[PDB]
């Protein structure tokens, strides 16, 4: 129970709010009245007050009061620096002269907790519980939430007949029904789905969290919170069990398998070893890419795949029920037993070992070990790995064969002895299965004991293990020490308590402990776990920062310059400089923490030294010249740095992209092992740049690995010395990477951002690119772009990056003429005459026609010899033949050569003829005929424009496109445009196509023809889509120039022979505007986002909500007229994940300026060109856009919408079920299922419901492709009708659809969910279905 009472540090009073504004009162029994808690949004929810502390930024001077956290009127966010309560814009709660808080920037003030006296108020900072299932796709609980006329701050019971705890995903349960069950480990009886009692005694339970699209990090978290763990596929038997026992056969789920540690190989998130593997080539293998997490599907093949962990997918949790003592798998694995052996052999704990240094094949080495009563080594515990690395400490001992190998095509790894596997230490990339060899054998490397597979025929050294028996009960190492380990002994005690302070000597004569390796850390963890006398204790460690510097370091024994090479910090633990390190005893055993040396209590640790004196440590000649002259560093520093201020010319880079760039030079994203390094890099930055903070640079500091304790780490393996924690502003889990700034400071960030960076390299530069082909760039002679022919063999999943580093990401073709030039050059006689890569990319088995450049593939030059080039999506990368130049697709890793390119070698207002619309120094006609007889084909409409004095529109810019779209609202007739398939890049008027709005699909998909075969004989003509679906609305495609059925837009510059009548539209600023079927108010005052919300509410309107591209287009013209930004009603309670509209309308429409712009803040505004931007809500902008809403009223029992049995989502007056979406099933079967359920198969009756569904189903992503629509296709008619007889008005097809495709047994129509189009399909296919009913 995290509730607390908050007291002023400087004044013995606390916040017992009371009515209206809160007040400072004595902590009398009113502590039993007013208490405080942290909730979903950072705000503080005052229990009893049933409120939520807010700050009115329009007038901060007013005393603070309690609001409803659903309120958008006031800023409710709060932040916690050291014992502060800090609001946005530097404000903070702070008592005025009077005893009432006036949160102000005036002066600092500090707060602490009553009761326990917690020195930090934020000891109970909120953590988000992800709901498992029941009405929502696994969102976090939103606290507090309004149940029946009352607020709740914790998961509750009342709502569900069943007694499991539940919560709401949205602030008000009554208004929105998105509830969900709450994680709980206690309710195992109903907490988990299926008990697989088949195991001997485990009674292992499984929870099949389908429907719960989550990132891997959140899935792992969720599974943990109930006491379970992400799925571990121990063996084929359990894999096949789950294969059948899961229900929705078409889903892909998270497992638990991962390679999140870039320095370690694939591993189960749980403690299970990775011995059984079912990798499938369905995913393409590359070592560098971000596919770090493992996905499993119950398809016919036994296949696992690699995905990006942030992707949202369902998952499965795994929990053993009998293992209460599971904290450590083995209890006595670390205790040393006095061992003896014969000459040549080295004794280790209770065993004999010997390394032969005789290169042998695996079979040869096994037979050699068998020559004696010995077998190749088997590793049972990390202690054996420690001994392995110690022995490989032999003079060369680079690698050794391990007594472990595979003997199956579906690989399962077993020892050379018929015994089970208990541990695995796979190297960074070496669980890699050589395609089909029957047996692959593992060798261990000397660096860390990392294992890697390879052909068993390889000749390598080998170590034979042998039995032994205890020599005696003596401990010759340190009889006085409590235990021995390796080359030291340990004498922990739970009596002496101060931080090593002793009258003489120390608590033990060798003083406090120092940790150099994870092996040592594990041993001491075992020690503490063995001697936990009283729970959650702490133990002192020699690491301290008493000479307050931030760079915590060991307390040095005599003249010892003891460095630090390993650390075990707790969650976001290395907070503040100064103090001493204490290691935790609570069940997260062994984690380190910082503590106060005069106030904290911890117990004594000891390290009896090596019985043989150690020699001198280092030579230290290396800083003579740490790196080549190319890189920068102090002479004397241990590493070198290089700052990358641009890409190609001035372009930035994502975090992982910059890291890969450092890697291809051999370096890492920079890291600070020392305050000296940090200061040196700051000084370098300020030597390079001005008195500016305009530049933010990437660094290695990151948090991308969540399976370990959530805490930051350097990508370079250097340990994190304390207090480099960028800021106390932690908890922003959405941000996972970090950036550096001048004045010695760091900022958390989202790794998806783009920035400049800096790489660090200790000793040796390894250029992989050498900046190839430094003068083969100039090719303007042929086109307007400069090309480059990369003759060096390279696969372009990576070479796209290097290609971008000077040019486009890859070459892309948009002209038969440029293709002729490319063929002429590529017709090279030498090895350069091989096939060549191009930017042509495939994203699915379908969707094989997108450039990685991002442009749609509008021009075709395929070779027709291989139209079946899919190879289960492996062949996804395009290439051109050297002999003909015809294209082809290939598996991307083949790494043939490639190419690159890059795109750089009187406006007076006037009169507008009648009927035309004057928009921007020009007039548009926008002829949309109402008569079929009046329709013109493109080659005719050109005549009309010419005779009228203009030409077909040339859409020069997004504002022109938006104007045309807004002047095309209700006319569902597409309209010609003035560009031709002959040249996608030049408008008919003769100027380049800089702007473009090509449709995502069907650009050349003429229904009456093949895509390509007859197209090459037919001219094609541009055409502006009038489709009412925002994915297509105002988009461009092509159609037969001779076709008819489409209007035309003529353009002609304004007639300047007279008044500049554009003033008639420029001058007026109508306070109210009408468009489509709604009315807008343009406010033009100085205000924040909250102020704009309040202003719209003080008006009768509400802050605008933009649900479609038509309204977005109108607002684009409006804002272009106004000339400056305005607020809009889009905001997010959570940082940059998913925004919501202030007025509560749901729509998937989004019009961001750029992908990263979504992340720059919490409240959204619109640019002068309409494009959206996120930003801090406290910013001040000179206007806003309100819209008048349609008024409606509600019933008394709409909460009837959902029962306790089924996940029913309420929308307006009807409920939809989405659980059935994944239940792939046939048409009539779905019909009958809904019928018997007491509902009807989905019916799209209005645009509001259409948009609501298109948004809601986006939560499942690619988990479903199509859904059945309850519409009958008439037999001898083209008509389509809902089961209720209502017309099919809402129907939509990207291009006008002929009925000629349905079979006599009528085809049945479904909804292509990712894009929203309709499509008739064979009626017996298996698809998802959605029931719907009234509330
Ligand atoms: C829209 O209205 C808001 C209303 O708040 C307005 O924001 C306010 O702007 C003023 C002016 O920038 C801020 O006042 C400043 O606050 C700082 C706080 O440290 C003071 O230091 C400033 O005084 C110093 O600087 C002055 C010259 O800049 C000197 O003359 C003076 O002697 C001091 O040296 C100054 O008072 C005010 O803080 C904000 N409001 C909030 C809540 O922060 C905003 O600017 C308006 N928008 C537009 C476009 O005008
Ligand atoms: C887009 O639509 C275009 C409109 O149709 C044309 O309209 C013109 C109006 O003046 C007509 O002149 C033109 O036909 C002319 O035909 C004469 C020869 O006359 C014979 O053929 C016509 C049909 O072409 C027939 O109606 C007569 O009775 C007679 O048998 C010819 O010498 C001229 O050059 C014109 O072609 C209409 N038809 C055509 C085909 O031009 C049309 O022009 C255009 O082709 C359409 N777009 C595409 C891609 O076909
Ligand atoms: C946050 O602070 C702002 C600014 O101090 C508050 O705005 C003010 O709210 C009052 C109402 O409490 C407004 O008074 C009303 O003005 C209208 C104007 O037409 C008048 O018709 C009413 O009879 C009444 O007098 C006041 O104008 C308004 N001032 C501004 C600059 O907007 C706001 O109420 C505060 N909100 C919260 C939740 O504390
Ligand atoms: C932190 O950043 C600043 C700016 O990027 C670094 O330079 C400092 O910049 C400020 C102006 O922003 C300078 O102040 C000016 O000083 C002159 C002195 O003649 C004065 O006439 C001006 O009116 C103004 O006050 C400041 O001097 C300057 N200091 C230095 C050392 O360059 C600053 O160095 C950065 N600090 C760190 C630790 O990186
Ligand atoms: C190990 O072998 C290398 C050559 O393979 C040799 O240079 C080196 O001196 C040997 N000893 C050690 C300790 O590396
Ligand atoms: C391991 O090898 C020994 C002989 O070295 C053998 O007796 C034993 O059975 C093997 N392990 C198992 C589980 O059988
Ligand atoms: C498959 O395994 C055999 C083992 O003899 C090996 O020669 C071959 O290179 C492997 N790969 C393929 C594609 O056959
Ligand atoms: C700081 O370091 C000096 C040695 O240079 C030492 O004598 C002194 O006690 C240290 N002070 C603290 C607070 O650690
Ligand atoms: C910094 O900018 C000022 C602008 O006045 C200029 O005088 C100075 O030379 C610049 N210095 C550097 C290092 O860019
Ligand atoms: C994969 O190949 C098989 C033939 O072995 C084919 O039946 C299947 O359709 C392919 N997969 C896809 C997604 O096309
Ligand atoms: C083109 O469409 C026709 C339709 O009859 C079909 O016969 C032919 O095989 C198709 N060719 C290609 C290359 O798609
Ligand atoms: C505008 O919306 C109202 C809503 O009741 C509807 O009755 C009216 O027909 C609509 N007008 C147009 C032109 O769509
Ligand atoms: C075709 O449509 C008409 C209504 O326009 C309807 O009466 C008739 O039954 C339909 N015929 C078939 C075969 O569906």
CB 1000 within 8 A of CB 856: yes
Segment (H or E) for 8: strand 6-8
Residue 441 CA, ligand 7 centroid: distance in Å: 15
Decide: 56 in ligand 3 pocket, CB within 6 A. yes
Flag whether 338 is in a domain: no
Exposed / middle / buried, residue 827 (Cβ in 10 Å: 0-12, 13-18, 19+): middle
Cα 1165 to Cα 57: distance, rounded to the nearest angstrom: 18
CB 1024 within 8 A of CB 975: yes
Ligand 8 proximal residues by C-beta, below 6 Å: 546-547
The number of CA neighbours under 13 Å toward the Cβ of 609 is 7
Q: Which long-range contacts (CB under 8 A, 24 or more apart) does 411-418 make?
A: 411/276, 411/277, 411/440, 412/235, 412/236, 412/275, 412/276, 412/277, 413/275, 413/276, 413/277, 413/442, 414/275, 415/376, 415/378, 416/366, 416/369, 416/375, 416/376, 416/378, 417/375, 417/378
Cβ count near 773 (within 10 Å) = 14
Cα 465 to Cα 460: distance, rounded to the nearest angstrom: 16
Tally of domains in the chain: 9
Atom index in ligand 11 nearest the CA of residue 864 equals: 13
Atom index in ligand 5 nearest the CA of residue 395 equals: 13
Kindly identify the ligand whose nearest atom is closest to the C-alpha of 947: 2
Kindly identify the ligand whose nearest atom is closest to the C-alpha of 868: 10
- Domain co-membership, 286 together with 412: no
Answer with the one of 414, 436, 466 that is the final residue of a domain.
466
CB 1053 within 8 A of CB 921: yes
- Domain co-membership, 721 together with 823: no
Exposed / middle / buried, residue 667 (Cβ in 10 Å: 0-12, 13-18, 19+): buried
Q: Which two tokens stand for residue 1243?
A: 């019916």
- Domain co-membership, 422 together with 358: yes
Cα 1259 to Cα 1262: distance, rounded to the nearest angstrom: 9
- Domain co-membership, 1211 together with 1310: yes
CB 339 within 8 A of CB 350: yes
Cα 742 to Cα 683: distance, rounded to the nearest angstrom: 8
C-alpha distance from residue 1119 to each of 1122, 1125, 1148, 1176, 1243 (Å): 5, 7, 22, 21, 37
Flag whether 427 is in a domain: yes
C-alpha distance from residue 983 to each of 336, 386, 819, 988, 1259 (Å): 79, 67, 13, 9, 39
| Beta carbons within 8 Å of 3's beta carbon, 6+ residues apart | 35, 36, 37, 47, 124
Atom index in ligand 2 nearest the CA of residue 937 equals: 1
CB 897 within 8 A of CB 914: no
Kindly identify the ligand whose nearest atom is closest to the C-alpha of 860: 11
Q: By alpha-carbon position, which residue is closest to atom 3 of ligand 8?
A: 547
Cα 647 to Cα 672: distance, rounded to the nearest angstrom: 24
Q: Which two tokens stand for residue 1101?
A: 């309107």
Local structure of 243: helix, strand or coil: helix
Cα 603 to Cα 592: distance, rounded to the nearest angstrom: 14
Answer with the one of 1157, 1187, 1217 that is the final residue of a domain.
1187
Kindly identify the ligand whose nearest atom is closest to the C-alpha of 578: 8
Q: By alpha-carbon position, which residue is closest to atom 42 of ligand 1?
A: 57
CB 96 within 8 A of CB 744: no
DSSP label at 1274?
Answer: P
CB 945 within 8 A of CB 922: no
Residue 578 CA, ligand 8 centroid: distance in Å: 12
Q: Which two tokens stand for residue 1294?
A: 């990207």
Cα 283 to Cα 847: distance, rounded to the nearest angstrom: 16
Q: In which residue are the tokens 């593997």 written?
A: 277
Cα 1027 to Cα 1318: distance, rounded to the nearest angstrom: 13
Residue 872 CA, ligand 10 centroid: distance in Å: 5
DSSP label at 1106?
Answer: -
What are the beta bridge partners of residue 485? Answer: 488
Q: Angle of helix 518-530 relative to helix 382-392, nearest 10 degrees? A: 140
CB 723 within 8 A of CB 712: no
Residue 1290 CA, ligand 13 centroid: distance in Å: 20
Decide: 743 in ligand 4 pocket, CB within 6 A. yes
Residue 982 CA, ligand 11 centroid: distance in Å: 24
Flag whether 772 is in a domain: no
Q: By alpha-carbon position, which residue is closest to atom 8 of ligand 8?
A: 547
Residue 1046 CA, ligand 2 centroid: distance in Å: 19
CB 1266 within 8 A of CB 1327: yes
Flag whether 333 is in a domain: no
- Domain co-membership, 383 together with 353: yes
| Beta carbons within 8 Å of 850's beta carbon, 6+ residues apart | 841, 842, 843, 856, 857
For residue 1057, the Cα-to-chain-centroid distance in whole angstroms is: 58
Local structure of 1275: helix, strand or coil: coil
- Domain co-membership, 494 together with 590: yes
Cα 83 to Cα 91: distance, rounded to the nearest angstrom: 14
Local structure of 757: helix, strand or coil: strand
Flag whether 139 is in a domain: no
CB 685 within 8 A of CB 310: no
Kindly identify the ligand whose nearest atom is closest to the C-alpha of 20: 3
Q: Which two tokens stand for residue 857?
A: 């593939």
Decide: 1010 in ligand 11 pocket, CB within 6 A. yes
Cα 438 to Cα 468: distance, rounded to the nearest angstrom: 34
Cα 317 to Cα 132: distance, rounded to the nearest angstrom: 11
Identify residues after which the chain is interrupted (C–N over 2.5 A). 905
Decide: 1057 in ligand 11 pocket, CB within 6 A. no
Q: Which two tokens stand for residue 316?
A: 């499965």
DSSP label at 649?
Answer: T
Decide: 1276 in ligand 13 pocket, CB within 6 A. yes
Q: Which long-range contacts (CB under 8 A, 24 or more apart) does 26-32 make?
A: 27/114, 31/5, 31/114, 31/115
Q: Which two tokens stand for residue 963?
A: 């104007």
Mutate to test the pocket of ligand 11, among 869, 1010, 1014 (most ligand atoms within 8 A of CB): 1010
Local structure of 825: helix, strand or coil: helix
Exposed / middle / buried, residue 618 (Cβ in 10 Å: 0-12, 13-18, 19+): exposed
Atom index in ligand 7 nearest the CA of residue 436 equals: 1
Residue 320 CA, ligand 10 centroid: distance in Å: 37
| Secondary structure of 172-198 as H, E, C letters | ECCCCCCEEECCCCCCHHHHCCEEECC
Atom index in ligand 4 nearest the CA of residue 685 equals: 39
- Domain co-membership, 611 together with 626: no
Nearest to 538 by CA among 585, 490, 485, 600: 585
Cα 582 to Cα 1137: distance, rounded to the nearest angstrom: 37
Kindly identify the ligand whose nearest atom is closest to the C-alpha of 1304: 13
Q: Which two tokens stand for residue 699?
A: 């660094």
- Give the residue numbers spanning the domain of 288: 185-319
Cβ count near 1084 (within 10 Å) = 13
Kindly identify the ligand whose nearest atom is closest to the C-alpha of 875: 10
Answer with the one of 301, 319, 337 that is the final residue of a domain.
319
CB 1037 within 8 A of CB 1070: no
Local structure of 1183: helix, strand or coil: coil
Residue 60 CA, ligand 1 centroid: distance in Å: 13
Phi, psi of 661 (to 5 degrees): -65, -40
Flag whether 1033 is in a domain: yes
Q: What burial letters (b/e) apply to 699-713, b meaning 16+ CB within 10 Å? A: bbbbbbbbbeebbbb
Q: Which two tokens stand for residue 240?
A: 């096949």
Cα 894 to Cα 357: distance, rounded to the nearest angstrom: 38
Flag whether 996 is in a domain: yes
Cα 954 to Cα 423: distance, rounded to the nearest angstrom: 67
CB 1323 within 8 A of CB 1305: yes
- Domain co-membership, 1153 together with 1086: yes
Q: Which two tokens stand for residue 1331?
A: 């029931």
C-alpha distance from residue 1069 to each of 237, 940, 1082, 1112 (Å): 73, 39, 9, 19
Extended strands (E) in 329-482: 346-348, 351-355, 375-376, 399-406, 413-415, 440-445, 451-455, 463-466
| Secondary structure of 1058-1102 as H, E, C letters | CCCCCHHHHCCCCCEEEECCEEEEEECCCECHHHHHHHHHHCCCE
| Cα dihedral across residues 507, 509, 514, 515: positive or negative | negative
Cα 1177 to Cα 1171: distance, rounded to the nearest angstrom: 17
Q: Which two tokens stand for residue 957?
A: 């810019």
Kindly identify the ligand whose nearest atom is closest to the C-alpha of 421: 6
CB 1282 within 8 A of CB 1243: yes
Cα 470 to Cα 446: distance, rounded to the nearest angstrom: 28
DSSP label at 95?
Answer: B
- Domain co-membership, 369 together with 462: yes
Decide: 690 in ligand 4 pocket, CB within 6 A. no
Mutate to test the pocket of ligand 7, among 281, 437, 439, 874 (most ligand atoms within 8 A of CB): 437
Residue 959 CA, ligand 4 centroid: distance in Å: 43
Residue 415 CA, ligand 6 centroid: distance in Å: 10
Phi, psi of 892 (to 5 degrees): -75, -20
C-alpha distance from residue 384 to each of 486, 707, 902, 975 (Å): 11, 24, 56, 75
Nearest to 83 by CA among 10, 1, 153, 12: 10
- Domain co-membership, 668 together with 735: yes
CB 655 within 8 A of CB 751: yes
C-alpha distance from residue 370 to each of 362, 497, 549 (Å): 12, 54, 58
Ligand 6 proximal residues by C-beta, below 6 Å: 375, 417-419
Atom index in ligand 13 nearest the CA of residue 1275 equals: 14
Atom index in ligand 11 nearest the CA of residue 1009 equals: 2
DSSP result, 967-994: TTSS--S-EEEEEETTBTTB-TTS-B--
Kindly identify the ligand whose nearest atom is closest to the C-alpha of 545: 8
DSSP label at 63?
Answer: P
Phi, psi of 316 (to 5 degrees): -140, 135
CB 1310 within 8 A of CB 1316: no
Q: By alpha-carbon position, which residue is closest to atom 6 of ligand 6?
A: 417
- Domain co-membership, 38 together with 63: yes
| Beta carbons within 8 Å of 189's beta carbon, 6+ residues apart | none
| Beta carbons within 8 Å of 197's beta carbon, 6+ residues apart | 203
Nearest to 316 by CA among 234, 250, 240, 233: 233
Atom index in ligand 8 nearest the CA of residue 547 equals: 14
Residue 944 CA, ligand 2 centroid: distance in Å: 15
Local structure of 1110: helix, strand or coil: helix
Cα 328 to Cα 726: distance, rounded to the nearest angstrom: 33
**Residue 144, preceding peptide bond in cis (omega within 30° of 0):** yes
Decide: 937 in ligand 2 pocket, CB within 6 A. yes
Decide: 870 in ligand 10 pocket, CB within 6 A. yes
**Technique of determination:** cryo-EM
Beta-strand pair 1078-1083/145-147 = unpaired
Kindly identify the ligand whose nearest atom is closest to the C-alpha of 1007: 11
Ligand 5 proximal residues by C-beta, below 6 Å: 395-396
Nearest to 1007 by CA among 979, 1032, 1043: 1043
Say which CATH number the domain at 574 has.
3.10.100.10
Q: Which two tokens stand for residue 486?
A: 């390796």
Q: By alpha-carbon position, which residue is closest to atom 26 of ligand 4?
A: 691
Q: In which residue are the tokens 């789905």 written?
A: 193
Q: What burial letters (b/e) apply to 684-698, b meaning 16+ CB within 10 Å? A: bbeeeeeeeeebbbb
Mutate to test the pocket of ligand 6, among 380, 419, 465, 467 (most ligand atoms within 8 A of CB): 419
Q: By alpha-carbon position, which residue is closest to atom 45 of ligand 2?
A: 1042
Cα 1303 to Cα 461: distance, rounded to the nearest angstrom: 69
CB 339 within 8 A of CB 351: yes
Flag whether 332 is in a domain: no
What are the beta bridge partners of residue 755? Answer: 653
Q: By alpha-carbon position, which residue is closest to atom 1 of ligand 6?
A: 417
Cα 362 to Cα 438: distance, rounded to the nearest angstrom: 14
Cα 155 to Cα 157: distance, rounded to the nearest angstrom: 7
Say which CATH number the domain at 2 has.
2.80.10.50
- Domain co-membership, 209 together with 300: yes
Cα 793 to Cα 799: distance, rounded to the nearest angstrom: 10
Residue 73 CA, ligand 3 centroid: distance in Å: 12
Q: Which long-range contacts (CB under 8 A, 24 or more apart) does 127-130 make?
A: 128/40, 129/155, 129/167, 129/182, 129/183, 129/225, 130/183, 130/212, 130/214, 130/218, 130/221, 130/222, 130/225
First-to-last C-alpha distance (Å) of the chain? 37
Nearest to 35 by CA among 75, 7, 63: 7
């Amino acid at each position: 129970k995290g509730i607390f009472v908050i007291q002023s540090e400087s004044l013995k009073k606390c916040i017992q709010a009371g009515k209206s504004v809160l007040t400072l009162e004595n902590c009398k029994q009113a502590n039993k009245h007013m208490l405080w808690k942290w909730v979903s949004n950072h705000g503080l929810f005052n229990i009893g007050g049933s409120g939520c502390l807010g700050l009115n930024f329009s007038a901060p001077e007013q005393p603070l009061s309690l609001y409803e956290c659903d309120s958008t009127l006031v800023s409710l966010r709060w932040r916690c620096n050291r014992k502060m309560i800090t609001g946005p814009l530097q404000y903070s709660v702070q008592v005025a002269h009077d005893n009432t808080v006036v949160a102000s920037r005036k002066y600092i003030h500090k707060w602490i907790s009553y009761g326990s006296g917690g020195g930090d108020i934020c000891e109970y900072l909120h953590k988000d519980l992800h709901t498992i299932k029941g009405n929502t796709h696994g969102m976090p609980c939103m606290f507090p939430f309004q149940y029946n006329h009352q607020w709740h701050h914790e998961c509750t019971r009342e709502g569900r007949e069943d007694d499991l705890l539940w919560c709401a995903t949205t602030s008000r349960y009554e208004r929105d029904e998105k509830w969900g069950f709450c994680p709980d480990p206690t309710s195992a009886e109903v907490g988990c789905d299926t008990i697989w009692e088949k195991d001997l005694n485990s009674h292992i339970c499984y929870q099949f969290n389908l429907l719960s699209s989550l990132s891997w990090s959140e899935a792992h978290s969720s599974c943990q919170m109930q006491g379970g763990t992400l799925l571990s596929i121990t063996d084929e038997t359990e894999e096949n069990f789950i294969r059948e026992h899961m229900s929705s056969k078409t889903v892909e789920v998270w497992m638990g398998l991962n390679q999140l540690d870039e320095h370690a190989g694939w591993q189960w998130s749980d403690g299970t070893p990775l011995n059984y593997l079912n990798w499938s080539p369905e995913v393409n293998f590359e070592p560098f890419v971000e596919d770090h997490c493992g996905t499993f599907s119950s398809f016919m093949p036994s296949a696992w795949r690699s995905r990006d962990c942030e992707s949202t997918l369902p998952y499965i949790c795994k929990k053993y029920l009998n293992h209460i003592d599971h904290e450590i798998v083995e209890k006595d694995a670390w205790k040393y037993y006095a061992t003896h052996c014969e000459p040549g052999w080295n004794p280790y704990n209770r065993n004999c070992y010997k390394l032969q240094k005789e290169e042998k094949t695996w079979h040869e080495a096994l037979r050699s070990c068998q020559a004696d009563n010995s077998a190749l080594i088997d590793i049972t515990s990390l202690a054996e790995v420690e001994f392995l690395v110690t022995l490989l400490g032999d003079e060369n001992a680079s690698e050794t064969w391990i007594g472990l190998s595979s003997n199956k095509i579906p690989v399962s790894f077993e020892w050379s002895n018929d015994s089970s596997v208990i541990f695995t230490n796979w190297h960074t990339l070496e669980p890699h299965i050589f395609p089909n060899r029957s047996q692959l054998c593992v060798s261990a490397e000397q660096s860390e004991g990392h294992w890697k597979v390879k052909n068993c025929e390889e000749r390598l050294f080998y170590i034979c293990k042998k039995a032994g028996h205890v020599l005696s009960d003596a401990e010759s190492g340190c009889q006085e020490g409590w235990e021995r380990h390796g080359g030291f002994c340990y004498k922990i005690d739970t009596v002496l308590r101060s931080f090593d302070q002793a009258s003489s000597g120390y608590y033990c004569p060798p003083a406090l402990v120092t940790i150099t390796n994870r092996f040592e850390q594990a041993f001491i963890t075992s020690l503490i776990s063995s001697v936990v006398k009283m729970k959650d204790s702490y133990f002192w460690i020699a690491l301290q920062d008493q000479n307050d510097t931030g760079e915590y370091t060991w307390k040095p024994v005599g003249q010892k310059p003891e460095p630090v090479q390993y650390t075990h910090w707790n969650t976001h633990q290395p907070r503040y400089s100064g103090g001493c390190v204490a290691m935790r005893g609570r069940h997260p055993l062994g984690r380190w923490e910082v503590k106060h040396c005069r106030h904290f209590k911890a117990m004594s640790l000891c390290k009896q030294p090596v019985e043989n004196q150690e020699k001198a440590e280092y030579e230290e000649r290396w800083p003579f010249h740490p790196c080549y002259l190319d890189w920068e560093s102090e002479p004397g520093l241990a590493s070198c740095f290089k700052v990358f201020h641009s890409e190609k010319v001035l372009m930035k880079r994502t975090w992982r992209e910059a890291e890969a760039f450092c890697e291809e030079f051999g370096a890492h994203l920079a890291s600070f092992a020392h305050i000296e390094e940090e200061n040196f890099v700051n000084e370098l930055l300020h030597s390079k740049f001005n008195w500016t903070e305009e530049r933010q640079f990437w660094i290695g500091f990151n948090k991308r690995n969540p399976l370990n304790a959530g805490s930051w780490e350097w990508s370079d393996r250097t340990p994190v010395v304390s207090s480099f924690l960028d800021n106390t502003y932690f908890g922003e889990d959405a941000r996972n990477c970090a950036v550096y700034k001048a004045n010695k400071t760091l900022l958390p960030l989202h790794c998806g951002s783009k920035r400049e960076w800096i790489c660090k390299i200790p000793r040796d530069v390894k250029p992989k690119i050498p900046f190839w082909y430094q003068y083969d760039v100039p090719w303007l002679f042929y086109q307007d772009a400069e090309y480059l022919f990369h003759t060096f063999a390279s696969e372009w999943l990576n070479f796209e990056f290097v290609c971008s580093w000077l040019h486009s990401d890859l070459l892309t073709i948009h002209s038969a003429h440029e293709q002729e030039f490319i063929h002429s050059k590529i017709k090279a006689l030498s090895k350069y005459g091989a096939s060549w890569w191009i930017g042509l990319q495939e994203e699915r088995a379908n969707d094989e026609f997108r450039w990685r450049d991002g442009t749609p593939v509008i021009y075709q030059n395929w070779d027709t010899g291989r139209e079946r080039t899919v190879n289960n999506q492996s062949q996804r990368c395009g290439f051109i033949s050297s002999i003909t130049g015809l294209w082809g697709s290939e598996e991307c890793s083949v790494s043939m050569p490639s190419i690159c390119k890059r795109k750089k070698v009187p406006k007076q207002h006037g009169t507008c003829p009648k009927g035309w619309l004057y928009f921007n120094y020009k007039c548009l006609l926008l002829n949309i005929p109402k008569d079929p007889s009046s329709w013109k084909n493109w080659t005719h409409a050109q005549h009309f424009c010419a005779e009228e004095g203009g030409t077909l529109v040339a859409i020069e810019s997004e504002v022109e496109q938006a104007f045309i779209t807004m002047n095309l609202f209700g006319q569902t007739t597409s309209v010609w445009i003035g560009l031709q398939n002959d040249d996608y890049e030049t408008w008919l008027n003769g100027k380049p196509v800089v702007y473009s709005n090509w449709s995502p699909f069907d650009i050349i998909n003429i229904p009456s023809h093949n895509t390509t075969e007859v197209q090459k004989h037919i001219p094609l003509c541009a055409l502006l889509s009038s489709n009412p679906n925002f994915h297509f609305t105002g988009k461009w495609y092509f159609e037969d120039c001779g076709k008819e059925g489409y209007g035309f837009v003529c353009e002609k510059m304004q007639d300047t022979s007279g008044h500049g009548v554009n003033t008639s539209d420029m001058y007026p600023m109508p306070n109210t505007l009408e468009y489509g079927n709604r009315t807008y108010k343009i406010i033009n005052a100085n205000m924040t986002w909250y102020a704009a919300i309040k202003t719209c509410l003080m008006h009768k309107a509400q802050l605008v909500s933009i649900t479609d591209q038509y309204h977005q287009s109108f607002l684009t013209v409006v804002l272009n007229r106004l000339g400056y930004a305005h607020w809009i009603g889009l905001f997010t309670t959570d940082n940059g994940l998913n925004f919501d509209w202030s007025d509560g309308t749901k729509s998937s429409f989004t019009f961001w300026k750029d992908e990263e712009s979504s992340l720059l803040g919490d409240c959204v505004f619109a640019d002068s060109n309409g494009r959206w931007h996120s930003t801090a809500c406290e910013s001040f902008l000179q206007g806003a856009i309100c819209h008048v809403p349609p008024e409606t009223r509600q019933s008394e029992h709409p909460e009837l919408c959902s029962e306790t049995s089924i996940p029913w989502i309420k929308f307006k007056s009807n409920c939809y079920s989405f659980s059935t979406v994944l239940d792939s099933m046939s048409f009539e079967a779905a019909h009958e299922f809904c019928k018997k359920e007491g509902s009807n198969l989905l019916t799209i009756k209005d645009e509001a419901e259409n948009a609501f569904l298109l948004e809601e189903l986006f939560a499942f992503g690619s988990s479903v492709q199509m859904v059945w629509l309850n519409a009958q296709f008439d037999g001898n008619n083209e008509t389509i009708k809902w089961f209720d007889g209502t017309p099919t008005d809402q129907s939509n097809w990207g291009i006008r659809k002929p009925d000629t495709d349905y079979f006599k047994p009528h085809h049945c129509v479904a909804l292509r969910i990712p894009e929203g189009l309709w499509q008739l399909s064979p009626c017996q296919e298996k698809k998802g279905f959605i029931c719907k009913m009234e509330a």
